[PDB]
Amino acid sequence: PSDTVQTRHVVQHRSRSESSIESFFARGACVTIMTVDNPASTTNKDKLFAVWKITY
Amino acid sequence: SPNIEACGYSDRVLQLTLGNSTITTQEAANSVVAYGRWPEYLRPTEPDVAACRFYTLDTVSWTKESRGWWWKLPDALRDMGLFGQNMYYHYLGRSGYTVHVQCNASKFHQGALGVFAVPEMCLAGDSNTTTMHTSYQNANPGEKGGTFTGFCPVDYLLGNGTLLGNAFVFPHQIINLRTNNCATLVLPYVNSLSIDSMVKHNNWGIAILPLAPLNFASESSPEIPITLTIAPMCCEFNGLRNITLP
């Protein structure tokens, strides 16, 4: 109970698996939204292609 | 009497962690056992750590005018957690005391404190025929304590009518600024009975008077603080009464 010696800390681990590195980033998040289209008309801006540099 | 010379500065910081408390004493060594006796059990309910742990009284300012200070046991520690409780809930009670008086200054301050533990220290009022005299409340100034003067305890008369110079018959240590910073006095239970009532009778009496004046280098700290940490040792009390909660 009440105690404030100065030991290392107190006890040993207590389950910390969901906090680990692999599990910290195991979630995929949105990185970008690319906008294409299939126009019949000559739209040179949105012209079919959409280019995006892969960056977080 | 206390002609010791540990080291002079500081070496080892060794903390006394009893129960909930923590002290961090200047060192550990250099302590005086009153008469060569350790607080022992009556040859009862023994609370141990519950009651046996360090409690700190109020800190008082030592100044170039100070005449002294005095306290009573268990009296002072009557407002201390479990030891404060067990004192009012029982008709009995005997206890030892580890009076650990600390006083810190610099290599620039000079003076000398003599911590005197007077067993059965009744205070000045020259009515031999009718002693006790001063009211229960005056005689018991709690944790804030009382003070000597140049209820009136005269310093050179140790506040009882006997020349201060002979005070050195009672257990004591001299906190001499150039040497020791701490004073350790273990006082075992001393009274006419095997056990008695704490609320009415005062066992010991811690009296710290100045043997040397306080002189500080040019301009520094105008005053230095003295602290009294007291602890109940090997205590027992009989027997719980209608735990008359206040």
mmCIF file of C-alpha atoms in Angstrom:
data_model
loop_
_atom_site.group_PDB
_atom_site.id
_atom_site.type_symbol
_atom_site.label_atom_id
_atom_site.label_comp_id
_atom_site.label_asym_id
_atom_site.label_seq_id
_atom_site.Cartn_x
_atom_site.Cartn_y
_atom_site.Cartn_z
ATOM 1 C CA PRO A 1 0.000 0.000 0.000
ATOM 2 C CA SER A 2 1.222 3.504 0.950
ATOM 3 C CA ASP A 3 4.944 3.587 0.237
ATOM 4 C CA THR A 4 7.644 5.895 -1.133
ATOM 5 C CA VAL A 5 11.051 4.293 -0.544
ATOM 6 C CA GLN A 6 13.185 4.789 -3.635
ATOM 7 C CA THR A 7 13.427 1.214 -4.997
ATOM 8 C CA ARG A 8 13.663 0.645 -8.734
ATOM 9 C CA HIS A 9 9.982 1.082 -9.090
ATOM 10 C CA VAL A 10 7.947 -1.665 -7.394
ATOM 11 C CA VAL A 11 6.834 -4.769 -9.290
ATOM 12 C CA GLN A 12 7.288 -6.344 -12.735
ATOM 13 C CA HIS A 13 5.425 -5.926 -16.012
ATOM 14 C CA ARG A 14 1.600 -6.020 -16.158
ATOM 15 C CA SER A 15 0.670 -6.779 -19.769
ATOM 16 C CA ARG A 16 1.688 -4.207 -22.410
ATOM 17 C CA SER A 17 1.112 -5.999 -25.750
ATOM 18 C CA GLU A 18 -1.375 -3.591 -27.358
ATOM 19 C CA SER A 19 1.050 -0.741 -26.775
ATOM 20 C CA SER A 20 4.022 -2.242 -28.628
ATOM 21 C CA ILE A 21 5.507 -0.762 -31.843
ATOM 22 C CA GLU A 22 3.977 -3.235 -34.308
ATOM 23 C CA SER A 23 0.611 -2.833 -32.601
ATOM 24 C CA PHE A 24 1.000 0.961 -32.396
ATOM 25 C CA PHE A 25 1.097 1.288 -36.214
ATOM 26 C CA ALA A 26 -0.979 -1.853 -37.141
ATOM 27 C CA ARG A 27 -3.724 0.615 -38.137
ATOM 28 C CA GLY A 28 -3.942 1.854 -41.689
ATOM 29 C CA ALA A 29 -4.883 5.533 -42.031
ATOM 30 C CA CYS A 30 -5.877 7.779 -44.946
ATOM 31 C CA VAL A 31 -2.886 9.189 -46.800
ATOM 32 C CA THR A 32 -4.396 10.963 -49.830
ATOM 33 C CA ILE A 33 -7.455 11.340 -52.091
ATOM 34 C CA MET A 34 -6.809 11.073 -55.864
ATOM 35 C CA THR A 35 -9.388 12.371 -58.330
ATOM 36 C CA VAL A 36 -9.635 10.954 -61.839
ATOM 37 C CA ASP A 37 -12.553 10.817 -64.334
ATOM 38 C CA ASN A 38 -13.684 9.460 -67.710
ATOM 39 C CA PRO A 39 -14.680 12.551 -69.690
ATOM 40 C CA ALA A 40 -15.980 12.451 -73.268
ATOM 41 C CA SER A 41 -14.933 16.131 -73.648
ATOM 42 C CA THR A 42 -11.394 17.555 -73.831
ATOM 43 C CA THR A 43 -10.747 18.547 -70.171
ATOM 44 C CA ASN A 44 -6.924 18.915 -69.995
ATOM 45 C CA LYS A 45 -6.726 19.629 -66.252
ATOM 46 C CA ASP A 46 -8.599 16.590 -64.956
ATOM 47 C CA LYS A 47 -7.384 14.747 -68.073
ATOM 48 C CA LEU A 48 -7.722 11.125 -67.102
ATOM 49 C CA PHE A 49 -4.436 10.867 -65.142
ATOM 50 C CA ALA A 50 -3.923 11.928 -61.548
ATOM 51 C CA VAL A 51 -0.403 11.992 -60.193
ATOM 52 C CA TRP A 52 0.514 11.855 -56.498
ATOM 53 C CA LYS A 53 3.918 11.465 -54.858
ATOM 54 C CA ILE A 54 3.891 8.737 -52.182
ATOM 55 C CA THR A 55 4.344 10.627 -48.933
ATOM 56 C CA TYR A 56 2.955 10.385 -45.453
ATOM 57 C CA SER B 1 30.349 15.625 28.898
ATOM 58 C CA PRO B 2 29.604 15.260 25.232
ATOM 59 C CA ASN B 3 33.249 15.589 24.125
ATOM 60 C CA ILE B 4 32.929 13.951 20.685
ATOM 61 C CA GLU B 5 34.362 14.906 17.281
ATOM 62 C CA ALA B 6 32.737 12.762 14.577
ATOM 63 C CA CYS B 7 34.119 14.360 11.431
ATOM 64 C CA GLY B 8 33.060 18.010 11.015
ATOM 65 C CA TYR B 9 31.354 18.234 7.611
ATOM 66 C CA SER B 10 29.066 15.705 5.972
ATOM 67 C CA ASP B 11 29.894 12.112 4.817
ATOM 68 C CA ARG B 12 26.845 9.796 4.635
ATOM 69 C CA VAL B 13 23.178 10.568 4.180
ATOM 70 C CA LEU B 14 21.380 7.608 5.657
ATOM 71 C CA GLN B 15 17.567 7.979 5.836
ATOM 72 C CA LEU B 16 15.421 6.576 8.637
ATOM 73 C CA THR B 17 12.168 5.367 7.005
ATOM 74 C CA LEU B 18 9.931 4.042 9.785
ATOM 75 C CA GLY B 19 6.376 3.225 8.794
ATOM 76 C CA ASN B 20 5.027 6.113 6.737
ATOM 77 C CA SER B 21 7.830 8.590 7.687
ATOM 78 C CA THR B 22 11.271 9.286 6.121
ATOM 79 C CA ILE B 23 14.051 11.340 7.763
ATOM 80 C CA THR B 24 17.353 11.446 5.813
ATOM 81 C CA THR B 25 19.572 11.920 8.931
ATOM 82 C CA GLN B 26 22.858 13.862 8.580
ATOM 83 C CA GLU B 27 24.559 10.473 9.001
ATOM 84 C CA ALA B 28 23.391 7.862 11.564
ATOM 85 C CA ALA B 29 26.219 7.496 14.136
ATOM 86 C CA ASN B 30 26.654 9.608 17.308
ATOM 87 C CA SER B 31 23.624 8.986 19.576
ATOM 88 C CA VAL B 32 23.119 9.025 23.342
ATOM 89 C CA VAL B 33 21.201 6.345 25.183
ATOM 90 C CA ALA B 34 19.680 7.840 28.349
ATOM 91 C CA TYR B 35 21.350 6.070 31.263
ATOM 92 C CA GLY B 36 22.341 3.122 28.977
ATOM 93 C CA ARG B 37 18.795 1.782 28.588
ATOM 94 C CA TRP B 38 16.779 1.016 25.502
ATOM 95 C CA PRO B 39 12.930 1.441 25.530
ATOM 96 C CA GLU B 40 11.680 -2.048 26.375
ATOM 97 C CA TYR B 41 8.310 -3.693 26.800
ATOM 98 C CA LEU B 42 6.718 -4.154 30.221
ATOM 99 C CA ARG B 43 7.942 -7.421 31.711
ATOM 100 C CA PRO B 44 -0.864 -5.505 26.537
ATOM 101 C CA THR B 45 -1.592 -4.166 23.014
ATOM 102 C CA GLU B 46 1.653 -3.356 21.158
ATOM 103 C CA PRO B 47 0.745 -1.288 18.015
ATOM 104 C CA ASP B 48 4.338 -1.110 16.712
ATOM 105 C CA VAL B 49 4.713 0.877 13.357
ATOM 106 C CA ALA B 50 1.062 2.060 13.732
ATOM 107 C CA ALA B 51 2.120 4.081 16.763
ATOM 108 C CA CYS B 52 5.897 3.621 16.347
ATOM 109 C CA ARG B 53 6.842 6.028 13.454
ATOM 110 C CA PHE B 54 8.447 9.549 13.113
ATOM 111 C CA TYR B 55 6.338 12.668 13.776
ATOM 112 C CA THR B 56 7.682 16.188 13.363
ATOM 113 C CA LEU B 57 6.758 19.070 15.635
ATOM 114 C CA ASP B 58 6.689 22.719 14.620
ATOM 115 C CA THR B 59 9.980 24.340 13.608
ATOM 116 C CA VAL B 60 11.135 27.283 15.731
ATOM 117 C CA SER B 61 13.445 30.192 14.907
ATOM 118 C CA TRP B 62 16.778 30.405 16.837
ATOM 119 C CA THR B 63 17.852 34.172 17.031
ATOM 120 C CA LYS B 64 20.535 36.371 18.710
ATOM 121 C CA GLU B 65 17.929 37.076 21.406
ATOM 122 C CA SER B 66 16.540 33.576 21.976
ATOM 123 C CA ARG B 67 16.607 32.494 25.611
ATOM 124 C CA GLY B 68 15.579 28.886 24.975
ATOM 125 C CA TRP B 69 12.697 26.519 24.387
ATOM 126 C CA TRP B 70 10.959 23.598 26.164
ATOM 127 C CA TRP B 71 8.433 20.848 25.496
ATOM 128 C CA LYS B 72 6.751 18.017 27.372
ATOM 129 C CA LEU B 73 6.230 14.316 26.567
ATOM 130 C CA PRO B 74 3.951 12.762 25.698
ATOM 131 C CA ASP B 75 2.245 16.178 25.780
ATOM 132 C CA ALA B 76 3.733 17.626 22.542
ATOM 133 C CA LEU B 77 2.909 14.504 20.560
ATOM 134 C CA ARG B 78 -0.719 14.621 21.807
ATOM 135 C CA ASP B 79 -1.807 15.940 18.381
ATOM 136 C CA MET B 80 -0.032 13.257 16.334
ATOM 137 C CA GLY B 81 -2.176 10.803 14.311
ATOM 138 C CA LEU B 82 -2.412 7.340 15.880
ATOM 139 C CA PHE B 83 -0.208 8.281 18.905
ATOM 140 C CA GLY B 84 -2.518 11.224 19.496
ATOM 141 C CA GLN B 85 -5.525 8.892 19.396
ATOM 142 C CA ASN B 86 -4.184 5.986 21.515
ATOM 143 C CA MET B 87 -3.326 8.620 24.156
ATOM 144 C CA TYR B 88 -7.006 9.645 24.712
ATOM 145 C CA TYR B 89 -8.659 6.244 24.139
ATOM 146 C CA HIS B 90 -6.698 4.433 26.840
ATOM 147 C CA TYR B 91 -6.431 4.888 30.670
ATOM 148 C CA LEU B 92 -2.882 3.547 30.570
ATOM 149 C CA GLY B 93 0.201 4.066 28.410
ATOM 150 C CA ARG B 94 3.953 3.930 28.616
ATOM 151 C CA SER B 95 6.325 4.957 25.819
ATOM 152 C CA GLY B 96 9.936 5.592 24.862
ATOM 153 C CA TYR B 97 11.210 8.530 22.764
ATOM 154 C CA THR B 98 13.766 8.991 20.050
ATOM 155 C CA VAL B 99 14.223 12.762 20.230
ATOM 156 C CA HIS B 100 16.100 13.550 17.071
ATOM 157 C CA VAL B 101 16.840 17.314 17.098
ATOM 158 C CA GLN B 102 18.281 18.719 13.898
ATOM 159 C CA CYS B 103 19.833 22.120 13.240
ATOM 160 C CA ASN B 104 21.468 23.203 10.052
ATOM 161 C CA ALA B 105 23.700 26.243 9.450
ATOM 162 C CA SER B 106 26.725 27.041 7.319
ATOM 163 C CA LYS B 107 30.451 26.921 7.896
ATOM 164 C CA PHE B 108 29.890 30.650 8.617
ATOM 165 C CA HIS B 109 27.512 30.511 11.641
ATOM 166 C CA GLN B 110 28.663 29.964 15.199
ATOM 167 C CA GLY B 111 27.027 28.939 18.476
ATOM 168 C CA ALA B 112 26.021 26.028 20.744
ATOM 169 C CA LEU B 113 22.773 24.229 21.591
ATOM 170 C CA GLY B 114 22.433 21.873 24.496
ATOM 171 C CA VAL B 115 19.454 19.587 24.244
ATOM 172 C CA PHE B 116 18.546 18.633 27.836
ATOM 173 C CA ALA B 117 16.080 15.904 28.590
ATOM 174 C CA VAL B 118 14.926 16.370 32.160
ATOM 175 C CA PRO B 119 12.949 13.461 33.571
ATOM 176 C CA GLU B 120 9.999 14.792 35.543
ATOM 177 C CA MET B 121 10.738 18.427 34.590
ATOM 178 C CA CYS B 122 8.406 20.560 36.726
ATOM 179 C CA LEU B 123 8.710 24.268 35.938
ATOM 180 C CA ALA B 124 9.587 27.303 38.104
ATOM 181 C CA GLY B 125 7.284 28.499 40.868
ATOM 182 C CA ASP B 126 9.158 28.370 44.206
ATOM 183 C CA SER B 127 6.079 27.128 46.195
ATOM 184 C CA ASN B 128 7.591 23.861 47.536
ATOM 185 C CA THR B 129 4.479 23.445 49.706
ATOM 186 C CA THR B 130 2.152 23.706 46.689
ATOM 187 C CA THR B 131 3.942 22.683 43.438
ATOM 188 C CA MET B 132 2.083 21.860 40.080
ATOM 189 C CA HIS B 133 0.354 25.281 40.605
ATOM 190 C CA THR B 134 0.251 26.629 37.018
ATOM 191 C CA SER B 135 -2.914 25.417 35.190
ATOM 192 C CA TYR B 136 -3.123 22.189 33.198
ATOM 193 C CA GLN B 137 -3.284 24.186 29.943
ATOM 194 C CA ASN B 138 -0.242 26.425 30.660
ATOM 195 C CA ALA B 139 1.807 23.442 31.842
ATOM 196 C CA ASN B 140 0.818 21.739 28.561
ATOM 197 C CA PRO B 141 1.664 24.060 25.594
ATOM 198 C CA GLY B 142 1.284 21.160 23.076
ATOM 199 C CA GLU B 143 3.298 21.006 19.849
ATOM 200 C CA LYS B 144 4.004 24.769 19.656
ATOM 201 C CA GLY B 145 5.830 24.610 23.020
ATOM 202 C CA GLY B 146 7.092 27.030 25.677
ATOM 203 C CA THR B 147 10.117 29.329 25.999
ATOM 204 C CA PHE B 148 12.797 30.253 28.614
ATOM 205 C CA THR B 149 13.410 33.802 29.847
ATOM 206 C CA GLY B 150 16.331 36.015 30.897
ATOM 207 C CA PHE B 151 4.507 29.994 33.977
ATOM 208 C CA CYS B 152 8.067 31.488 33.953
ATOM 209 C CA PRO B 153 11.194 29.278 33.469
ATOM 210 C CA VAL B 154 14.496 31.150 34.165
ATOM 211 C CA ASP B 155 17.282 29.994 31.877
ATOM 212 C CA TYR B 156 20.290 29.960 34.289
ATOM 213 C CA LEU B 157 17.973 28.302 36.801
ATOM 214 C CA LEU B 158 17.021 25.756 34.071
ATOM 215 C CA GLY B 159 13.489 26.974 34.811
ATOM 216 C CA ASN B 160 13.344 25.108 38.124
ATOM 217 C CA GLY B 161 15.652 26.879 40.672
ATOM 218 C CA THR B 162 18.952 25.005 40.060
ATOM 219 C CA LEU B 163 22.069 26.487 38.321
ATOM 220 C CA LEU B 164 22.181 25.659 34.608
ATOM 221 C CA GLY B 165 25.789 24.531 34.861
ATOM 222 C CA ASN B 166 24.712 21.414 36.694
ATOM 223 C CA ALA B 167 22.070 20.589 34.045
ATOM 224 C CA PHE B 168 24.764 18.290 32.664
ATOM 225 C CA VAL B 169 23.553 15.557 35.048
ATOM 226 C CA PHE B 170 20.550 14.829 32.846
ATOM 227 C CA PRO B 171 21.067 12.982 29.518
ATOM 228 C CA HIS B 172 22.205 15.462 26.831
ATOM 229 C CA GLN B 173 24.246 16.329 23.747
ATOM 230 C CA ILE B 174 25.630 19.645 22.551
ATOM 231 C CA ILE B 175 24.802 20.650 18.975
ATOM 232 C CA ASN B 176 27.965 22.696 18.496
ATOM 233 C CA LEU B 177 27.710 24.451 15.147
ATOM 234 C CA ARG B 178 31.339 23.849 14.132
ATOM 235 C CA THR B 179 30.931 20.068 14.582
ATOM 236 C CA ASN B 180 27.500 18.328 14.862
ATOM 237 C CA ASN B 181 24.343 19.230 13.014
ATOM 238 C CA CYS B 182 22.181 16.544 14.694
ATOM 239 C CA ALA B 183 21.288 15.439 18.223
ATOM 240 C CA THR B 184 19.963 11.931 18.967
ATOM 241 C CA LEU B 185 18.457 11.182 22.382
ATOM 242 C CA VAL B 186 16.785 7.890 23.131
ATOM 243 C CA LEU B 187 14.806 8.354 26.344
ATOM 244 C CA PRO B 188 13.363 5.215 27.958
ATOM 245 C CA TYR B 189 10.177 5.398 30.026
ATOM 246 C CA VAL B 190 10.910 6.940 33.430
ATOM 247 C CA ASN B 191 8.214 7.248 36.124
ATOM 248 C CA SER B 192 7.387 6.007 39.597
ATOM 249 C CA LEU B 193 5.034 3.355 38.091
ATOM 250 C CA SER B 194 5.207 0.433 35.679
ATOM 251 C CA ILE B 195 2.603 2.136 33.488
ATOM 252 C CA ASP B 196 0.467 5.252 34.122
ATOM 253 C CA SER B 197 -1.959 7.756 32.549
ATOM 254 C CA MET B 198 -0.351 9.881 29.853
ATOM 255 C CA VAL B 199 -2.927 12.663 29.722
ATOM 256 C CA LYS B 200 -2.127 13.826 33.301
ATOM 257 C CA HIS B 201 1.543 12.926 33.977
ATOM 258 C CA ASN B 202 4.538 14.220 31.972
ATOM 259 C CA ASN B 203 7.419 11.756 31.781
ATOM 260 C CA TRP B 204 10.286 13.680 30.138
ATOM 261 C CA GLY B 205 10.925 17.282 29.161
ATOM 262 C CA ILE B 206 12.996 18.394 26.195
ATOM 263 C CA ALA B 207 14.691 21.717 26.953
ATOM 264 C CA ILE B 208 17.034 23.316 24.403
ATOM 265 C CA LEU B 209 18.838 26.386 25.715
ATOM 266 C CA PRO B 210 21.691 28.318 24.075
ATOM 267 C CA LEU B 211 25.128 27.757 25.649
ATOM 268 C CA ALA B 212 26.874 30.028 23.100
ATOM 269 C CA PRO B 213 25.240 33.034 21.337
ATOM 270 C CA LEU B 214 24.477 33.061 17.580
ATOM 271 C CA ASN B 215 26.843 35.015 15.402
ATOM 272 C CA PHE B 216 26.461 35.229 11.657
ATOM 273 C CA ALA B 217 29.098 36.342 9.157
ATOM 274 C CA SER B 218 28.522 39.977 8.131
ATOM 275 C CA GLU B 219 25.144 39.748 6.519
ATOM 276 C CA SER B 220 23.608 36.272 6.035
ATOM 277 C CA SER B 221 20.520 34.510 7.372
ATOM 278 C CA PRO B 222 19.267 36.578 10.383
ATOM 279 C CA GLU B 223 18.142 33.414 12.077
ATOM 280 C CA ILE B 224 18.505 29.625 11.760
ATOM 281 C CA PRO B 225 15.818 27.005 12.224
ATOM 282 C CA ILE B 226 15.877 24.092 14.703
ATOM 283 C CA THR B 227 13.639 21.043 14.189
ATOM 284 C CA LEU B 228 12.450 18.396 16.657
ATOM 285 C CA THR B 229 11.451 15.008 15.348
ATOM 286 C CA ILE B 230 10.091 12.716 18.077
ATOM 287 C CA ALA B 231 9.093 9.059 17.877
ATOM 288 C CA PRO B 232 7.261 6.696 20.224
ATOM 289 C CA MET B 233 9.290 3.572 21.034
ATOM 290 C CA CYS B 234 8.082 0.124 22.163
ATOM 291 C CA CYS B 235 4.698 1.475 23.329
ATOM 292 C CA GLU B 236 1.652 -0.300 24.805
ATOM 293 C CA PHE B 237 -1.805 0.807 26.047
ATOM 294 C CA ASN B 238 -4.611 -0.939 28.028
ATOM 295 C CA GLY B 239 -7.531 -1.126 27.265
ATOM 296 C CA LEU B 240 -9.859 0.369 24.641
ATOM 297 C CA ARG B 241 -12.797 2.145 26.191
ATOM 298 C CA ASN B 242 -16.012 2.910 24.286
ATOM 299 C CA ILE B 243 -13.675 4.149 21.499
ATOM 300 C CA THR B 244 -15.441 7.331 22.495
ATOM 301 C CA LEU B 245 -15.090 8.933 19.067
ATOM 302 C CA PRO B 246 -14.806 12.721 19.521
#
